[PDB]
């Protein structure tokens, strides 16, 4: 008579259409609530009391403009639990106060933990090394730094990203105008990893597909492959010669090639997370001091760097009153920075 | 411009003049490069996960592959068996040719659309404009996140090339 | 008595080129911010 | 341009210390018995 823990372990790890596992006990509720919260909020829930914004299909928004918006700045970093001291158990008030935002962020965080645990659990059951789990640490570092650490360094959850397409675009532009985020070398390494990752994806796929051996008679070549076959389906030797002659260098080790494909985008995302942790504290790469000293003394000195700061100053002045309503900004027309005519 | 900060200047002005973020071809572009990076990491991790043991604990596993060897260096059945259980069985590629075609196609198509975004906003067919799209029963504008984007775009617009415009509309 | 836990260390030429590229490009990236 | 005076030594050491680390490892790899 084996005990209940082992009986439960058996049932959890049965081979079924959707694997459950111990990790599924955490993953499936939290992922479902995170996704369901987003669909519920973008379909039915307003942002009038937190942002002065409509944000749902019910109010007339579309897929690009709906969002589950962050709570009001006056909530601070409240967990905003439904039973907490702000909503005090009132589901309607909870939605009006932004409780769905922390609901989604927190269930999403634990869901991501559950998913990485699932990657470990399945890898261990089938007998492969858990590099897929290791690669997933980059999405987790991005989510934790952007949706948790960044607002926790700022005044409140209000300045976290809101969960929506246009809301996320606003977040990009805010980071340009207030943080000069494009100037940040940690964001630049992130860009390099994403664009380099997309490059590796495209070039590897294209190379395999254009150095295939003829292993069948079809003009469509997909059927001439068998998953159990021993032989490489494409010529590493021919691919190596082509790239050596075209580009100067080429892969020669297939294992190094595929590890590099993990390394590049994963490292890029990790570097971007580090920059955002800095931005949590307003520790920006905002200025080059030597540039400002020269420009302040020499009114004929101009670079693309000084041109972008003027753009940032426009962004801040023109977006802050409606984007930060709790500040009650009134900027009389005469104080708004503007070039000629426009 | 041919420079790093000049690139950012081009992007910011472009957003002011075309609302490129709200253009679906740029959105396909982002899906292309985000997806390209994801599938890169994915493919890299799955093949690496299934390397056949050919080395000892103190050697790099890369020495387990010899350039030009005839045998495949990883167990794609093992990798597929892992990935099919992570999502569900039919969501995974067991055909290496289909898999690598997908890896080529997804970023290439998305970046094609990115390029077509720039090339069609070149003729001023711009991103979606939902400015003041939501109106209450009296007629008050009820702002959405699109209107907040518009406020940021305005700041870019009024400041860029601050000495170059003499007339009220920036028509090119 | 000799320590049996010692092992030789290796860095092949490709790794040298990869590492120098990483270091030099990182330096090219971060130097502007060091000068500020 | 009034740049940070420590920028030069910082960049120089940033290049030289890890580059020299790799050169040491490479050369002592080449010199091992073949």
């Amino acid at each position: 008579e084996r005990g209940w823990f082992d009986i439960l372990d058996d049932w959890l790890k049965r081979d079924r259409f959707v694997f459950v596992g111990w990790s599924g006990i955490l993953l499936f509720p939290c992922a479902y609530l995170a996704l369901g919260g987003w669909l519920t909020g973008t379909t039915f829930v307003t942002s009038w009391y937190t942002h002065g914004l409509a944000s749902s299909y019910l109010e007339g928004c579309n897929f690009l403009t709906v969002a589950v918006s962050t709570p009001a700045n006056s909530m601070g970093h409240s967990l905003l639990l439904l039973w907490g001291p702000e909503a005090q158990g009132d589901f309607t008030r909870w939605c009006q106060l932004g409780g769905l935002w922390t609901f989604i962020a927190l269930h999403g965080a634990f869901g991501l933990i559950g998913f990485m645990l699932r990657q470990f659990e399945i890898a261990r059951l089938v007998g492969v090394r858990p590099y897929n789990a290791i690669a997933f640490s980059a999405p987790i570092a991005v989510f934790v730094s952007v949706f948790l650490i960044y607002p926790l360094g700022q005044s409140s959850w209000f300045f976290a990203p809101s969960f929506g397409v246009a809301a996320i675009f606003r977040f990009l532009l805010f980071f340009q105008g207030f943080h000069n985020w494009t100037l940040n070398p940690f964001h630049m390494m992130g860009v390099a990893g994403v664009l380099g990752g997309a490059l590796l994806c495209a070039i590897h796929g294209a190379t395999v597909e254009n150095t295939l051996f003829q292993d069948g008679e079809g003009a469509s070549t997909f059927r001439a492959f068998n998953p159990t076959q021993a032989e490489e389906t494409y010529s590493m030797v021919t691919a190596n010669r082509f790239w050596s002659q075209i580009f100067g260098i080429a892969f020669s080790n297939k294992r190094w090639l595929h590890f590099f494909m993990l390394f590049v985008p994963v490292t890029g995302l990790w570097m971007s997370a580090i920059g955002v942790v800095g931005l949590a504290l307003n520790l920006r790469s905002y200025d080059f001091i030597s540039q400002e000293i020269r420009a302040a003394e020499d009114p004929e000195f101009e670079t693309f760097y000084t041109k972008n700061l003027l753009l940032n100053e426009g962004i801040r002045a023109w977006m802050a009153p409606q984007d930060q309503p709790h500040e009650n900004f009134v900027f009389p027309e005469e104080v708004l920075p503007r070039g000629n005519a426009l | 411009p041919l420079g790093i900060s000049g690139t950012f200047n081009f992007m910011i002005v472009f957003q002011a003049e075309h609302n490129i973020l709200m253009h679906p071809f740029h959105q396909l572009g982002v899906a292309g490069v985000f997806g390209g990076a994801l599938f890169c990491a994915m493919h890299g991790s799955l093949v690496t996960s299934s390397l056949i043991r050919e080395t000892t604990e103190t050697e790099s596993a890369n020495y387990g592959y010899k350039f030009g060897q005839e045998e495949e260096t990883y167990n794609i059945v093992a990798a597929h068996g892992y990935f099919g259980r992570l999502i569900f069985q039919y969501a995974s590629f067991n055909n290496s040719r289909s898999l690598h075609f997908f890896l080529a196609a997804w970023p290439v198509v998305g970046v094609w659309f990115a390029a077509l975004g720039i090339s069609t906003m070149a003729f001023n067919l711009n991103g979606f404009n939902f400015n003041h799209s939501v109106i209450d029963a009296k007629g008050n504008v009820i702002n959405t996140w699109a209107d907040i984007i518009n406020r940021a775009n305005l700041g870019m617009e009024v400041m860029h090339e601050r000495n170059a415009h003499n007339f009220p509309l920036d028509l090119a | 008595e000799p320590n049996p836990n010692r092992q030789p260390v290796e860095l092949n030429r490709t790794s040298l080129y990869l590492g120098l590229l990483l270091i030099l490009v990182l330096a090219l990236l971060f130097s502007s911010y060091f000068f500020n | 341009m009034e740049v940070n005076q420590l920028g030069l030594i910082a960049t120089a050491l940033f290049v030289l210390v890890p580059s020299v680390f790799l050169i040491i490892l490479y050369v002592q790899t080449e010199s091992q018995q073949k």
Binding site: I249 | - | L21, A27, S31 | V3, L8, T11
Partner: peptide, 30 residues
């Protein structure tokens, strides 16, 4: 001194390209 530093690092990178291509470890079939 900053310009010299930037141009020096760039020049080292171009030199590395030269060695990485023409003085690479030759790919060999075993």
């Amino acid at each position: 001194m900053e310009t010299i530093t930037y141009v020096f690092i760039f020049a080292c990178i171009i030199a590395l390209f030269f060695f990485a291509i023409f003085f690479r470890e030759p790919p060999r079939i075993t």
